[PDB]
C-alpha cells in the first residue's frame, strides 16, 4: 500500500519532461478546442470584384479570386 | 517553464495535504489519489481542464489566471484578438 500511495506524481518528473507534457496537453486542450468563424467573411471577400470594371481591362469581366 | 514549476509546487503541496488528511477516510483517499495515481499525461490533461466553466480541475485561481492571460496574449499575437 506504500507504493499505492506513492505512485509517480507529476512533481517528481524533471522540469523539461513536465514542460513537454504540458506543451502537448495545452495544444490538445486549448489550441485545437479554440474555434473562430471566418469562412463567410473570407468567401465574400474573395467573391468581390475589386474595382475591376474601373480598371482598364478593355475586355469582358475578369474572373474574381474565388472563380 | 514557470507555469509548470508553479503547477508542480501546487501538486506537491496538495499531495502533502492529502497525505496529512488521509486519516479522515479511506474511501476519500482513493478518489483524492486518482490524480496522483493517474498516468503523467492524463495528469497534465486534467490539470489543464480549467478552461470553460466546468471547473472540476483542482487548479487554483492564480495559476488559472496565468494561463487565462497567456492564452489571450497568444491569441492576440496570432490575430484572433
From Swiss-Prot, chain A:
Tissue spec. comment: Detected in heart muscle (at protein level). Heart muscle, brain (cerebellum and hippocampus) and placenta.
Localization, UniProt: Sarcoplasmic reticulum membrane
Inducing factors: By TGFB1.
Entry PTM: Channel activity is modulated by phosphorylation. Phosphorylation is increased in failing heart, leading to calcium leaks and increased cytoplasmic Ca(2+) levels.
Superkingdom assignment: Eukaryota
Subunit structure comment from the entry: Homotetramer. Can also form heterotetramers with RYR1 and RYR3. Interacts with FKBP1A and FKBP1B; these interactions may stabilize the channel in its closed state and prevent Ca(2+) leaks. Interacts with CALM and S100A1; these interactions regulate channel activity. Identified in a complex composed of RYR2, FKBP1B, PKA catalytic subunit, PRKAR2A, AKAP6, and the protein phosphatases PP2A and PP1. Interacts directly with FKBP1B, PKA, PP1 and PP2A. Interacts with SELENON. In cardiac muscles, identified in a complex, composed of FSD2, CMYA5 and RYR2.
Biological role stated in the UniProt entry: Cytosolic calcium-activated calcium channel that mediates the release of Ca(2+) from the sarcoplasmic reticulum into the cytosol and thereby plays a key role in triggering cardiac muscle contraction. Aberrant channel activation can lead to cardiac arrhythmia. In cardiac myocytes, calcium release is triggered by increased Ca(2+) cytosolic levels due to activation of the L-type calcium channel CACNA1C. The calcium channel activity is modulated by formation of heterotetramers with RYR3. Required for cellular calcium ion homeostasis. Required for embryonic heart development.
Similarity-based family: Belongs to the ryanodine receptor (TC 1.A.3.1) family. RYR2 subfamily.
Domain text: The calcium release channel activity resides in the C-terminal region while the remaining part of the protein resides in the cytoplasm.
Associated disorder: Ventricular tachycardia, catecholaminergic polymorphic, 1, with or without atrial dysfunction and/or dilated cardiomyopathy: An arrhythmogenic disorder characterized by stress-induced, bidirectional ventricular tachycardia that may degenerate into cardiac arrest and cause sudden death. Patients present with recurrent syncope, seizures, or sudden death after physical activity or emotional stress. CPVT1 inheritance is autosomal dominant.
Record's protein name: Ryanodine receptor 2
Organism of origin: Homo sapiens (Human)
Taxonomic placement: Eukaryota, Metazoa, Chordata, Craniata, Vertebrata
Part of the whole protein covered: 3599 to 3665 of 4967
